[PDB]
């Protein structure tokens, strides 16, 4: 096995650049529980929240365009279509509500979950929403007729996070019973399980190119290849967890938000963790309220958006000075996992 360890002292990864804090946007009155940004014009967030509003911010200036209210209890999640001009948001009152942007109103209510709904995603080529939450099944909503065509039965626990992809394995989901399934829809059943993680699997993301999926866990953040449901890599992470979120990028940066209030960026290829940051919590807050509840990257790949339990959004910028000058991070001493 030592072979394996000799190899890891060669390749010596991919210099990436630091990050820092460009901007802080207050204005929500609760925690900020999801962010989702235009797949087209990059002018605007849309930001979930725990006061049940959803405010639409402006990317460049940081001003507030509008408020879409219209939920009773907290909104967990949002998604914005590419093809359609729609916006599905979903909350914990058990309801998955389409929106229509052109008029800024609600349109279709999809319906039938037994209990609160923690995640939506919007399949790319088919016109289908997919959703799931504490019921432990993943429903696949047809969009115009509102029928839940198919229900993916499955795990043994709340479902934290659902992702869609164009070829097979079409739908991928992770769940507090510590798996991650890879679903084959028409068949209607699981095509593969990846069991490794040790406790709940709390986040995921899809490499926007490489066709694989980062799956966090509590304290150890693996990747996985699709098609085979390989293993691929294992990011060097001591216990910094609890990992709330992942975000991949176009340059193969990886983000990961902690609840201890630490941003942890990685290279994707490697596992090398090349930067950490204490997120200055806030004015009058409570040390527990430093944490990070969501992340995403704009469409350019150069700007970071996160919400935080202290009722605010922060936007992080990729500092250009860098190169090597005195750039380097933690300097690559791969260890025995």
């Amino acid at each position: 096995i030592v072979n394996r360890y000799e190899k890891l002292l060669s390749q010596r990864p991919e210099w990436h650049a630091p990050w820092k804090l460009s901007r802080v946007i207050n204005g929500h009155l609760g925690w900020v529980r999801c962010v989702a940004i235009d797949p087209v014009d990059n002018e605007w967030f849309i930001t979930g929240s725990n006061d049940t509003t959803m405010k639409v911010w402006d990317l460049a200036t940081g001003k507030l365009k509008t408020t879409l209210a219209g939920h009773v209890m907290t909104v967990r999640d949002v998604a914005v279509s590419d093809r359609h001009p729609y916006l599905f948001s979903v909350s914990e009152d058990k309801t998955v509500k389409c929106w229509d942007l052109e008029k800024n109103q609600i349109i279709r209510d999809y319906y039938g979950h037994l209990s609160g709904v923690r995640t939506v995603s919007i399949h790319p080529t088919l016109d289908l929403i997919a959703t799931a939450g504490r019921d432990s099944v993943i429903k696949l909503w047809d969009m115009r007729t509102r029928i839940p065509v198919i229900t993916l039965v499955g795990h043994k626990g709340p479902i934290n996070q659902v992702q869609c992809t164009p070829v097979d394995p079409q739908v991928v989901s992770s769940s507090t019973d510590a798996t991650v399934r890879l679903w084959d829809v028409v068949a209607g059943k699981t095509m593969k399980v990846l069991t490794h993680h040790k406790r709940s699997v709390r986040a995921t993301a899809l490499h926007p190119k490489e066709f694989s999926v980062a799956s966090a866990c509590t304290d150890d953040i693996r990747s996985w290849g699709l098609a085979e449901g390989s293993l691929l890599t294992n990011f060097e992470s001591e216990k910094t967890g609890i990992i709330n979120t992942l975000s991949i990028n176009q340059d193969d940066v990886l983000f990961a938000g902690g609840d201890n209030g630490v941003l942890s960026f990685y290279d994707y290829k490697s596992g090398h963790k090349y930067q950490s940051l204490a997120t200055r919590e806030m004015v009058g807050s409570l040390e527990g309220e430093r944490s990070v509840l969501c992340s995403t990257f704009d469409k350019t790949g150069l700007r970071l958006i996160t919400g935080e339990a202290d009722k605010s959004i922060k936007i992080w910028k990729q500092d250009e000075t860098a190169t090597k000058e005195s750039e380097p991070g933690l300097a690559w001493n791969p260890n025995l996992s």
Partner: peptide
């Protein structure tokens, strides 16, 4: 029989495939 006994589990499924080479292509 060595294969019959533990048959299912096998070590090649613990072992990450980009540890050897980065750049393995997908």
């Amino acid at each position: 029989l060595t294969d019959q006994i533990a048959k299912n589990v096998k070590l090649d499924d613990f072992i990450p495939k980009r540890q050897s080479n980065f750049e393995l292509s997908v």
